[PDB]
Amino acid sequence: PPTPHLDAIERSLRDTSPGLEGSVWQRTDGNRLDAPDGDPAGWLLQTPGCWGDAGCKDRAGTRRLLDKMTRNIADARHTVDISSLAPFPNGGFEDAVVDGLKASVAAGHSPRVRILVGAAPIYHLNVVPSRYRDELIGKLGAAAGKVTLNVASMTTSKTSLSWNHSKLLVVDGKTAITGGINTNKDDYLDTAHPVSDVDMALSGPAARSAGKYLDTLWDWTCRNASDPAKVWLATSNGASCMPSMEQDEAGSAPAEPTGDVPVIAVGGLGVGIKESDPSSGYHPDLPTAPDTKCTVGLHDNTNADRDYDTVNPEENALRSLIASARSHVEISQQDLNATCPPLPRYDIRTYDTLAGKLAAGVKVRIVVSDPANRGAVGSGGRSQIKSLDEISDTLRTRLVALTGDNEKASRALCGNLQLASFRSSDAAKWADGKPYALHHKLVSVDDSAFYIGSKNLYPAWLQDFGYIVESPAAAQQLKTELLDPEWKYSQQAAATPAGCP
Ligand SMILES: CCCC(=O)OC[C@H](COP(=O)(O)O)OC(=O)CCC
């Protein structure tokens, strides 16, 4: 079965980051999207799960996610690997970890557990690694003695604003859950205005790839625990730091296939873990584009740093995913643009890819969080634009720089772009009064290949991770369960760009 989209992406990754293949990115065959019996699209873990339910009273999606987390952890024979943005998992997310670990120990297992959060320099951690570890030990009760814990919070670069943003639960290097959902109660559980988000669950070789990716983060984390300004670390039972837990579990035997799905796992190392992939011949012609709307204070890693690309293959992976689109591309994000300054306002190569698609007659849909969303920098659901015009005006600009004249740009823009704010029902706001907040990091292309992960399309220099699936059948499920409903309701909040019918 042909995989023309994964093939193009694989070429981009082998060109950008050849030395990171097998660790920070990896293509594998033989995966299974991990759906429960009698719910074939159940591998797609949407939250809160209230399409066309403005009141959203039975938040069945959140319950299905927490249940799947607990069950995966309950099945752990050897290793549990969790990463998140700070804080450490709390609320129902912590209940899932505790319940699943107690069940695993009850079944006779002595699991090793890594829990990694990234922390912004401005963010004050209320519950520090030693306190979180003590809290888990108490909740684990008698089972604590059989559980080997590594708990760590980390910041890889204070000046370039880089820390772990990946959101992973890997069990035994066999199952993996990833997506945009942060494991903290205040965004998804304890709230009447819940953020809209999506995770995906799979099993097979691509779960090991995510494990290998976490081994790269923990190799750095264990070494840099010598610098407490960068790493706070706590272990239990006198355990050592476990930098290579996933590799030790994997062994020498290659991962066993569990289905027939081809998957590209891909992440990035942000800034401050590794300066470049020094086996890489990557030599891009980096775009000359200005922006009389903003200029960065910090050196622009997104738009003007060859080295950063080579240790952040996920940036080019998303670009080449969009560039592989021969018929249509759906983008569903919190944001396309970042707050500038301190970060660049947008990723020039991404917007140039999109404009090229528009000019070639490819359909482009962009759904972002409502600009009405004001929140602090770390808020799930915030918006970094004041109006959707900051997206179409940017495409309009990149279109004239491409084509030559402005009405050629208008025919591309007005006839091929759908641009809207997220809605999940007929209500413009939650019943709560507050607006809908969108936290997806999702791209889907030609109803055949899609990314679900933690890497936003707007500029950010964090450590991120996600999966690119190519599967017409799975993308059909994605279309039915998420994209078609999203457009059904978001189109009520559509934008008509400046200069269009
Ligand atoms: C505590 C604030 C920092 C933070 O929380 O780090 C992740 C944040 C939220 O990510 P997201 O949930 O919007 O995807 O992203 C960024 O702004 C990083 C660039 C400065």
Residue-wise DSSP of 451-483: EEES--SS---SEEEEEEEE-HHHHHHHIIIII
Nearest to 500 by CA among 391, 377, 396, 384: 396
DSSP label at 36? P
Closest residue CA from atom 1 of ligand 1: 378
Which of 83, 84, 85, 197 is the pocket-test mutation for ligand 1 (most atoms within 8 Å of CB)? 85
Pocket of ligand 1 contains residue 112 by CB under 6 Å? no
SS3 sequence of 295-344: CCCCCCCCCCCHHHHHCCHHHHHHHHHHHCCCCEEEEEECCCCCCCCCCC
Nearest to 331 by CA among 430, 220, 419: 419
Token digits of residue 456: 């936003």
Closest residue CA from atom 14 of ligand 1: 456
Is 186 among the residues known to form the active site? Answer: no
Is 440 among the residues known to form the active site? Answer: no
Pocket of ligand 1 contains residue 121 by CB under 6 Å? no
The three-class DSSP label of residue 256 is coil
Q: Which residues of 465-500 are buried (b: 16+ CB within 10 A; e: fewer)?
A: bbbbbbbeebbebbbebbbebbbebbeebbbebeee
Pocket of ligand 1 contains residue 165 by CB under 6 Å? yes
Nearest to 97 by CA among 131, 57, 139: 139
Which of 343, 377, 455 is the pocket-test mutation for ligand 1 (most atoms within 8 Å of CB)? 377
Peptide bond preceding 342: is omega within 30 degrees of 0, i.e. cis? yes
Distance 38 CA to ligand 1 centre (A): 37
Pocket of ligand 1 contains residue 457 by CB under 6 Å? no
Pocket of ligand 1 contains residue 460 by CB under 6 Å? yes
Asked if 289 and 401 touch (Cβ cutoff 8 Å), the reply is: yes
Distance 168 CA to ligand 1 centre (A): 16
Which backbone phi and psi does 16 adopt, to 5 degrees? -75, -45
Rounded Cα–Cα distance for residues 455 and 465 (Å): 6
Catalytic residue among 165, 215, 305, 347: 165
Rounded Cα–Cα distance for residues 395 and 327 (Å): 18
Which DSSP helix (H) or strand (E) runs through 286? none
Which of 160, 165, 301 is the pocket-test mutation for ligand 1 (most atoms within 8 Å of CB)? 165
Is 439 among the residues known to form the active site? Answer: yes
Q: Are β-strands 168-171 and 175-179 bridged in parallel, bridged antiparallel, or unpaired?
A: antiparallel
The three-class DSSP label of residue 365 is strand
Distance 449 CA to ligand 1 centre (A): 26
Token digits of residue 294: 């903003």
Q: Which segments of 80-192 does DSSP mark as H helices, in order?
A: 91-106, 129-140, 185-188
DSSP label at 438? B
Rounded Cα–Cα distance for residues 384 and 402 (Å): 26
Cα R_g (the chain), whole angstroms: 22
Q: Determined by which method?
A: X-ray
DSSP 179-215: ES--S-HHHHTS-SSPPBEEEEEEESHHHHHHHHHHH
Resolution (A): 2.2
Sorted by sequence, the CB contacts under 8 Å of residue 355 that are 6+ apart come out as 395, 398, 399, 402, 412
Rounded Cα–Cα distance for residues 289 and 148 (Å): 50
Residue 225, Cβ density class (10 Å: 0-12 exposed, 13-18 middle, ≥19 buried): middle
Pocket of ligand 1 contains residue 459 by CB under 6 Å? no
Rounded Cα–Cα distance for residues 305 and 282 (Å): 11
Asked if 461 and 157 touch (Cβ cutoff 8 Å), the reply is: yes
Side-chain-side CA neighbours of 475 within 13 Å: the count stands at 21
Pocket of ligand 1 contains residue 120 by CB under 6 Å? yes
Is 335 among the residues known to form the active site? Answer: no
Pocket of ligand 1 contains residue 342 by CB under 6 Å? no
Rounded Cα–Cα distance for residues 366 and 331 (Å): 5
